[PDB]
Amino acid sequence: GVFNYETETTSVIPAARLFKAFILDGDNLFPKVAPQAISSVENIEGNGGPGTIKKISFPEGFPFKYVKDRVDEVDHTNFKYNYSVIEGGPIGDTLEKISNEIKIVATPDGGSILKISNKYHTKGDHEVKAEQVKASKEMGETLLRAVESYLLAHSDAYN
């Protein structure tokens, strides 16, 4: 079955620029700006569109070594990015896939809001609790804040 978790978080970076950096150049940015969260991003197959597969590796001592994701949809107009975690780490005999959706919306102060849906697809039993899903949220926030800091300091990047 499916467990759905939704959250929102704010950014001080305008939506289009954040989308260009965090989404469209994340493979480069994350290992650069948050190497103690993501050690590397490997493009396995594809050009970035639907079906593209990447391997996201984590630093030594993290609970999981890597995951592979597959890009599901990229909406450059509405700043939407959907992808699925389809192998590695927690994926196996209890968890079949994690389907995620990110949407970035502009706020009038010149910042943005990220609207996130995480859907865990399990094989029958058992359960995915909010407390454990906190690790997803924490990692996501760490990556966002690292990218934000870079974009604040490098004003010529991703305009």
Ligand X SMILES: C[C@H](CCC(=O)O)[C@H]1CC[C@H]2[C@@H]3CC[C@@H]4C[C@H](O)CC[C@]4(C)[C@H]3C[C@H](O)[C@]12C
Can you say which residues are annotated as belonging to the binding site for brassinolide?
54, 81, 83, 100
Which region, judged by CB under 6 A, interacts with ligand X, from 12-20, 61-69, 72-80, 107-115? 61-69
Site string for ligand X, 8-37 (x = CB under 6 A): ---------------x--xx--x-------
Scan residues 111-140 and list those touching ligand X (CB under 6 A).
118, 128, 132-133, 135-136, 139-140
Distant-in-sequence, close-in-space partners of 46: CB < 8 Å, separation ≥ 6: 52, 53, 71
* Binding footprint of ligand X, residue count (CB under 6 A): 29
Residues placed in the known binding site? 54, 81, 83, 100
**63, two tokens:** 């609970």
**50, two tokens:** 């639907």
Residue 85 carries which DSSP code? E
Task: Verify binding: residue 64, ligand X, rule CB under 6 A.
Answer: yes
Q: Are 107 and 127 in contact (CB under 8 A)?
A: no
Which region, judged by CB under 6 A, interacts with ligand X, from 10-18, 72-80, 88-96, 106-114? 88-96
* Partner residues linked to 121 by β-bridges: 2, 97
d(CA 158, CA 155) in angstroms, rounded, equals 8
- In sign, the C-alpha dihedral spanning 153, 155, 157, 159 is positive
Which residues are near ligand X by CB under 6 A? 23, 26-27, 30, 54, 56, 58, 62-64, 67, 69, 83, 85, 89-90, 94-95, 98, 100, 118, 128, 132-133, 135-136, 139-140, 143
